Coordinates of C-alpha atoms in Angstrom, one line a residue:
Chain A
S1 CA 0.0 0.0 0.0
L2 CA 1.1 3.6 0.4
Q3 CA 2.6 3.7 3.9
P4 CA 6.0 5.4 3.6
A5 CA 7.7 2.1 4.7
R6 CA 6.1 0.2 1.9
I7 CA 7.4 2.5 -0.8
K8 CA 10.7 1.2 -2.2
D9 CA 13.4 3.8 -3.0
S10 CA 13.4 2.3 -6.6
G11 CA 9.8 3.6 -7.0
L12 CA 6.1 2.8 -6.8
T13 CA 4.8 -0.6 -8.0
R14 CA 2.0 -0.6 -10.6
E15 CA -0.4 -1.4 -7.8
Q16 CA 0.8 1.5 -5.7
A17 CA 0.7 3.9 -8.7
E18 CA -3.0 2.9 -9.2
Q19 CA -3.7 3.7 -5.5
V20 CA -2.1 7.1 -6.1
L21 CA -4.3 7.6 -9.1
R22 CA -7.4 6.6 -7.1
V23 CA -6.5 9.3 -4.5
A24 CA -6.0 11.8 -7.4
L25 CA -9.5 10.9 -8.9
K26 CA -11.3 11.4 -5.6
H27 CA -10.5 15.1 -5.8
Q28 CA -12.0 15.3 -9.3
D29 CA -15.1 13.1 -8.4
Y30 CA -15.2 10.9 -11.5
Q31 CA -17.5 8.4 -9.7
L32 CA -15.2 5.4 -9.2
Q33 CA -17.8 3.4 -7.3
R34 CA -20.6 3.1 -9.8
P35 CA -21.5 -0.1 -11.6
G36 CA -19.7 -0.6 -14.9
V37 CA -16.8 1.8 -14.1
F38 CA -13.3 0.5 -14.0
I39 CA -9.6 1.5 -13.9
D40 CA -7.4 -0.6 -16.1
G41 CA -3.6 -0.6 -15.7
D42 CA -3.0 -3.4 -18.2
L43 CA -1.7 -0.9 -20.8
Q44 CA 1.4 -2.2 -22.7
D45 CA 3.7 -1.5 -25.6
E46 CA 4.7 -4.2 -28.1
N47 CA 7.3 -5.6 -25.6
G48 CA 5.0 -5.7 -22.6
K49 CA 6.4 -2.6 -21.1
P50 CA 4.6 0.5 -19.8
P51 CA 3.9 2.9 -22.8
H52 CA 5.5 5.9 -21.2
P53 CA 9.0 5.4 -19.6
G54 CA 9.0 6.6 -16.0
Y55 CA 5.3 6.2 -15.6
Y56 CA 2.5 3.5 -15.3
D57 CA -0.5 4.3 -17.5
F58 CA -4.1 3.7 -16.6
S59 CA -7.5 4.0 -18.4
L60 CA -10.7 5.0 -16.7
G61 CA -13.8 3.7 -18.4
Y62 CA -17.4 2.7 -18.3
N63 CA -19.6 0.0 -19.8
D64 CA -23.3 0.7 -20.1
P65 CA -25.6 -1.9 -21.6
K66 CA -27.5 0.7 -23.4
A67 CA -24.3 1.7 -25.2
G68 CA -22.7 -0.3 -28.0
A69 CA -19.0 0.3 -26.9
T70 CA -16.9 1.1 -23.9
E71 CA -16.9 4.8 -23.0
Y72 CA -13.5 6.2 -21.7
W73 CA -13.2 9.1 -19.4
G74 CA -9.4 9.4 -19.0
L75 CA -6.0 8.1 -19.9
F76 CA -3.5 8.8 -17.0
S77 CA 0.2 8.5 -16.4
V78 CA 1.5 8.2 -12.9
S79 CA 5.2 8.6 -12.2
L80 CA 6.9 5.7 -10.4
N81 CA 9.4 8.1 -8.8
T82 CA 7.3 11.1 -7.7
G83 CA 3.6 10.1 -8.1
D84 CA 3.2 13.0 -10.5
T85 CA -0.1 12.3 -12.3
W86 CA -1.2 13.5 -15.7
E87 CA -4.2 13.0 -17.9
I88 CA -2.3 12.7 -21.2
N89 CA -5.1 13.4 -23.7
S90 CA -6.2 16.7 -22.1
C91 CA -2.7 17.2 -20.9
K92 CA -3.7 18.2 -17.4
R93 CA -1.6 17.7 -14.3
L94 CA -3.8 16.4 -11.6
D95 CA -3.8 18.2 -8.2
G96 CA -5.4 18.4 -4.8
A97 CA -4.1 18.5 -1.2
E98 CA -4.3 14.8 -0.6
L99 CA -2.5 13.9 -3.8
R100 CA 0.3 16.4 -3.2
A101 CA 0.8 15.0 0.3
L102 CA 1.2 11.5 -1.2
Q103 CA 3.6 12.8 -3.8
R104 CA 5.8 14.4 -1.1
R105 CA 5.8 11.1 0.7
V106 CA 6.8 9.2 -2.4
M107 CA 9.6 11.7 -3.2
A108 CA 11.0 11.5 0.4
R109 CA 11.3 7.7 -0.1
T110 CA 12.7 7.7 -3.7
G111 CA 14.9 10.8 -3.3
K112 CA 13.7 11.9 -6.8
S113 CA 12.3 15.2 -8.0
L114 CA 10.0 16.4 -10.8
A115 CA 13.1 17.9 -12.4
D116 CA 14.8 14.5 -12.3
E117 CA 12.2 13.1 -14.7
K118 CA 11.9 16.1 -17.0
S119 CA 12.9 14.1 -20.1
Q120 CA 10.5 11.3 -19.3
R121 CA 7.7 13.9 -18.6
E122 CA 8.4 15.4 -22.0
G123 CA 7.7 11.9 -23.4
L124 CA 4.1 12.4 -22.4
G125 CA 3.8 15.0 -25.2
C126 CA 2.1 17.5 -22.9
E127 CA 4.8 20.2 -22.4
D128 CA 7.5 21.6 -24.5
Chain B
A1 CA 6.6 19.5 -31.7
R2 CA 5.2 18.5 -28.3
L3 CA 2.7 16.1 -30.0
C4 CA 5.5 14.2 -31.7
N5 CA 7.3 13.6 -28.3
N6 CA 4.6 11.0 -27.2
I7 CA 6.2 8.1 -29.0
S8 CA 3.4 5.6 -28.1
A9 CA 0.8 7.9 -29.6
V10 CA 2.8 8.7 -32.7
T11 CA 3.5 5.0 -33.2
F12 CA -0.2 4.2 -33.2
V13 CA -1.1 7.0 -35.5
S14 CA 1.6 6.1 -38.0
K15 CA 0.7 2.4 -37.9
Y16 CA -3.0 2.8 -38.7
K17 CA -3.6 6.2 -40.5
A18 CA -3.5 4.7 -44.0
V19 CA -5.8 1.8 -43.2
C20 CA -8.4 4.2 -41.7
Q21 CA -8.5 6.3 -44.8
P22 CA -10.9 4.3 -47.1
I23 CA -13.3 3.6 -44.2
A24 CA -13.4 7.3 -43.3
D25 CA -13.9 8.1 -47.0
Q26 CA -16.8 5.7 -47.2
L27 CA -18.4 7.5 -44.2
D28 CA -17.6 11.0 -45.5
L29 CA -15.4 11.7 -42.5
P30 CA -11.9 13.2 -42.0
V31 CA -9.6 10.3 -41.3
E32 CA -8.6 11.8 -38.0
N33 CA -12.2 11.5 -36.7
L34 CA -12.1 7.7 -37.2
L35 CA -8.5 7.3 -36.1
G36 CA -9.1 9.6 -33.1
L37 CA -12.0 7.5 -32.0
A38 CA -9.7 4.4 -32.2
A39 CA -7.1 6.3 -30.1
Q40 CA -9.7 7.0 -27.5
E41 CA -11.1 3.5 -27.3
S42 CA -7.7 1.7 -27.4
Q43 CA -5.5 4.1 -25.5
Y44 CA -3.4 4.6 -28.6
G45 CA -3.3 0.8 -29.2
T46 CA -2.0 0.0 -25.7
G47 CA -5.2 -1.4 -24.2
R48 CA -5.7 -5.2 -23.8
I49 CA -8.9 -5.4 -25.9
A50 CA -7.1 -3.8 -28.8
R51 CA -3.8 -5.8 -28.4
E52 CA -5.3 -9.2 -27.7
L53 CA -8.7 -9.0 -29.4
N54 CA -8.0 -6.5 -32.2
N55 CA -11.0 -4.6 -31.1
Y56 CA -9.8 -1.0 -31.5
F57 CA -13.3 0.5 -31.1
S58 CA -14.1 -1.4 -27.9
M59 CA -17.3 -2.7 -29.5
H60 CA -19.7 -4.6 -27.3
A61 CA -20.5 -8.1 -28.5
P62 CA -22.3 -9.0 -30.7
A63 CA -20.8 -6.9 -33.4
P64 CA -20.7 -7.4 -37.2
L65 CA -17.6 -9.2 -38.4
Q66 CA -16.7 -10.5 -35.0
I67 CA -14.8 -13.8 -34.7
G68 CA -15.7 -14.3 -31.0
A69 CA -16.5 -12.5 -27.8
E70 CA -15.1 -12.2 -24.3
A71 CA -16.0 -10.4 -21.0
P72 CA -13.6 -7.6 -20.1
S73 CA -22.5 -8.3 -17.6
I74 CA -21.1 -7.3 -21.0
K75 CA -19.0 -9.0 -23.5
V76 CA -16.7 -7.3 -26.0
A77 CA -16.1 -8.5 -29.5
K78 CA -13.0 -10.1 -31.0
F79 CA -11.8 -9.3 -34.6
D80 CA -9.2 -10.5 -37.1
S81 CA -7.6 -7.1 -37.3
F82 CA -7.8 -3.3 -36.7
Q83 CA -9.3 -3.0 -40.1
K84 CA -12.1 -5.5 -39.3
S85 CA -12.9 -3.7 -36.1
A86 CA -13.1 -0.4 -38.0
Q87 CA -15.4 -2.0 -40.6
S88 CA -17.5 -3.3 -37.7
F89 CA -17.9 0.2 -36.3
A90 CA -18.8 1.4 -39.8
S91 CA -21.4 -1.3 -40.2
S92 CA -23.2 -0.6 -36.9
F93 CA -22.7 3.2 -36.5
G94 CA -21.6 4.5 -39.9
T95 CA -24.9 5.7 -41.2
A96 CA -25.4 7.5 -37.9
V97 CA -22.1 9.4 -38.0
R98 CA -21.6 9.8 -41.7
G99 CA -20.8 13.3 -43.0
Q100 CA -20.3 14.6 -39.4
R101 CA -16.9 16.1 -40.3
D102 CA -16.6 18.7 -37.5
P103 CA -15.0 16.9 -34.5
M104 CA -17.7 18.2 -32.1
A105 CA -20.5 17.2 -34.4
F106 CA -18.9 13.8 -34.8
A107 CA -18.8 13.2 -31.1
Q108 CA -22.4 14.4 -30.7
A109 CA -23.5 12.0 -33.4
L110 CA -21.7 9.2 -31.6
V111 CA -23.8 9.9 -28.5
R112 CA -27.0 10.2 -30.5
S113 CA -26.3 6.8 -32.2
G114 CA -26.0 5.1 -28.8
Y115 CA -22.3 4.2 -29.4
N116 CA -21.7 5.8 -26.0
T117 CA -24.3 7.3 -23.7
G118 CA -21.9 10.1 -22.9
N119 CA -24.1 11.2 -20.0
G120 CA -12.6 16.2 -15.3
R121 CA -13.2 19.5 -16.9
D122 CA -14.6 19.0 -20.4
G123 CA -17.6 17.0 -21.4
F124 CA -17.6 13.9 -23.7
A125 CA -17.7 15.8 -27.0
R126 CA -14.9 18.3 -26.3
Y127 CA -12.7 15.6 -24.8
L128 CA -13.0 13.4 -27.9
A129 CA -12.8 16.4 -30.3
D130 CA -9.4 17.3 -28.6
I131 CA -8.2 13.7 -29.2
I132 CA -9.2 14.0 -32.9
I133 CA -7.3 17.3 -33.2
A134 CA -4.2 15.7 -31.5
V135 CA -4.4 12.8 -33.9
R136 CA -4.6 15.1 -36.9
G137 CA -1.3 16.7 -35.6
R138 CA 0.4 13.4 -34.9
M139 CA -0.2 12.3 -38.5
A140 CA 2.5 14.8 -39.4
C141 CA 5.1 13.2 -37.0

């Protein structure tokens, strides 16, 4: 989970990154506990690796039987080293007091900064 | 510039932009509208339903041209290829979205057709329209 002691200095696991995202999404509402809604972290490139180096990616979606296809509400990238969380279609950095507190805890464990992952962040295609 | 730095996204757009063209033409749509929808549904080709089931439009089963179905309450279709999943979308929803070239109009027609019920900051249409515009730009990368 997200106790400081359970965060390895090598970074968040995929499961921990999802928990960070879930904290992030509480601040935006998004309705995570409604039937048909899911967060999916099984997003992979052709070699089975996360699509955006330095991050784990997650989709937020919804299946309604009156629809004919899945409806998607977000595609997110969560940094393994800082917990920085972006919605990478709208190119918005998620925020909120609870999320920032978690990120400071993650960074105190990994010893890494937002500046340390500047190149990887640029790889999200959301900032120059 | 920035758009081209998302390698995953550029890879997806480069891979499938040409195969989307004739289907978009048949529906009187800019190709980016169709390819943008696939990018939305498949997380630029990284989602499991796309990778494993070739279902790049996350079509619920049963869908035309499907070769099988699998639960991800609701089953999703399996296809032979991206192209078949796009043809399936066209079969079920094409008449409803045809000629809706403006990205907002396209997204609104998608909702009217029942593809998504469609009902963060922006609403469903603006969010999808932004993906379509991003795809248009990534086609140049």
